[PDB]
Design a protein around this ligand. Structure first.
Ligand SMILES: [Zn+2]
Ligand SMILES: [Zn+2]
Ligand SMILES: [Zn+2]
Ligand SMILES: [Zn+2]
Lengths: 88, 92
């Protein structure tokens, strides 16, 4: 029977299901492909995303959580800067 | 005392004699990073290409100090999460 899954960001569960790169991270609702091209960019490289690529649930969560931190950083930054601009 | 402290960031005044956890100098360290809360503010001024006169007896209400403390805490969870996942990407 067993057809078998492999994380593009680490390794192998004969599969808590594995995600395509078009899967959306929840906080921004942008594709998890876009979060991977963000991290590639943070270290001055290209990535090649085959239409094969899947993600373990662990990695999908890691990437989700990063995007989530990145959102709640950008929003609390605006709350605080717009406060700085204000009077009394 | 007679004790009248004014918040640099919201303008709340507190009038004392007093209380528990109360107003903070701009040298008070933010917990999860230990930059001085003046640095956190100089950072926020940069973000809107302005800068600030931190006049030398300035003060912060707890709530504002909490709020800057937590921004600092988020930025640190960005610093460390990002070292991890890019390092992960380098493995191939
Ligand atoms: Zn596909
Ligand atoms: Zn994985
Ligand atoms: Zn305040
Ligand atoms: Zn002082």
């Amino acid at each position: 029977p067993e057809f078998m899954d492999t994380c593009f960001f680490c390794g192998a569960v004969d599969l808590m299901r594995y995600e395509t790169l078009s899967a959306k991270v929840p906080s921004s609702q942008k594709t998890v492909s876009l979060v991977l091209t963000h991290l590639a960019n943070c270290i001055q490289t290209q990535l090649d995303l085959k239409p094969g690529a899947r993600l373990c649930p662990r990695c999908f969560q890691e990437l989700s959580d990063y995007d989530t931190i990145m959102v709640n950083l950008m929003t609390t930054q605006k709350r605080l800067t717009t406060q700085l601009k204000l009077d009394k």
